[PDB]
Amino acid sequence: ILPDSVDWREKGCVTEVKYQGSCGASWAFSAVGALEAQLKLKTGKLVSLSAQNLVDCSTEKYGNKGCNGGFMTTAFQYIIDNKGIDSDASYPYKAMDQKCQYDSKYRAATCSKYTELPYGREDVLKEAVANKGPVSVGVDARHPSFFLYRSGVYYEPSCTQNVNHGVLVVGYGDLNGKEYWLVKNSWGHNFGEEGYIRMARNKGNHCGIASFPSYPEILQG
Numbered sequence: 001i002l003p004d005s006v007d008w009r010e011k012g013c014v015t016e017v018k019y020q021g022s023c024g025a026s027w028a029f030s031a032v033g034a035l036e037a038q039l040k041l042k043t044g045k046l047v048s049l050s051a052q053n054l055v056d057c058s059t060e061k062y063g064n065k066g067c068n069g070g071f072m073t074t075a076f077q078y079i080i081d082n083k084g085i086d087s088d089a090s091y092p093y094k095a096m097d098q099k100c101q102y103d104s105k106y107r108a109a110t111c112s113k114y115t116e117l118p119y120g121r122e123d124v125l126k127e128a129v130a131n132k133g134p135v136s137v138g139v140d141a142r143h144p145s146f147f148l149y150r151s152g153v154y155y156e157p158s159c160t161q162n163v164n165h166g167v168l169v170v171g172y173g174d175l176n177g178k179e180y181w182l183v184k185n186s187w188g189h190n191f192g193e194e195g196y197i198r199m200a201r202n203k204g205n206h207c208g209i210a211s212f213p214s215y216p217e218i219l220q221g
């Protein structure tokens with residue numbers, strides 16, 4: 001049995017919406033966002049983590065291509081391997097590819113492990129969002145209705161399950177019979193609902209929302 005509604009913002013576990021700009025780094029924002037919530041849960045402090053650290057440093061060895069795209073899973077693996085990720089304040093976002101400038105002096109989080117969830121299992125995604133925290137996912141955002149979304153529960157008939165844009169599921173709910181996922185985007189505050197989009201839930205893995213979910217953990221010790 002799971003709660004009907006979850007919103008991790010209400011628990012102080014979600015940083016401000018970021019603005020990725022011309023750099024295709026949504027995969028990096030998806031990853032730091034999920035890790036930011038685990039960090040808050042563990043330490044009580046809400047700290048933006050460095051998406052730029054991932055763009056510059058979680059590169060070819062991790063199958064990623066910086067501003068040309070990447071994976072949250074291998075972003076997490078880089079953080080594990082690196083034994084750290086810097087704070088965003090110490091290593092801020094420039095929306096461009098740069099040399100890796102990681103400096104452990106400003107490490108703001110670690111990552112013990114990450115977990116991947118089954119493709120298309122929206123019931124499994126729901127349990128993880130409720131019991132673990134915000135979950136990194138990909139969505140199919142290659143539709144003008146996505147770029148032009150303003151408000152409400154987003155449903156795009158021509159959406160597919162093949163994902164191309166990283167986002168953060170920070171909750172879910174039901175608005176008078178329309179079930180939705182609460183999704184943090186990285187297109188700044190003027191996109192959608194103060195930078196968030198509520199996306200149709202339990203509608204056959206709509207827009208691939210549960211195609212590739214993953215979440216990191218920071219274990220005691």
Ligand SMILES: O=C(CO)N1CCc2c(c(-c3ccc(C(F)(F)F)c(SCCN4CCC(F)CC4)c3)nn2C[C@@H](O)CN2CCCCC2)C1
Nearest residue numbers: 027063065068069070071137138161162163164165166212
């Ligand atoms: O959607 C479908 C089919 O339904 N995909 C085909 C299979 C697939 C897809 C994704 C996936 C998940 C999240 C995101 C996003 F959130 F960022 F948006 C994306 S965006 C595409 C990211 N890409 C762009 C070109 C390159 F720069 C490499 C990164 C894709 N993961 N996987 C599974 C594996 O292939 C992952 N791989 C396993 C071996 C080790 C490395 C990771 C896309």
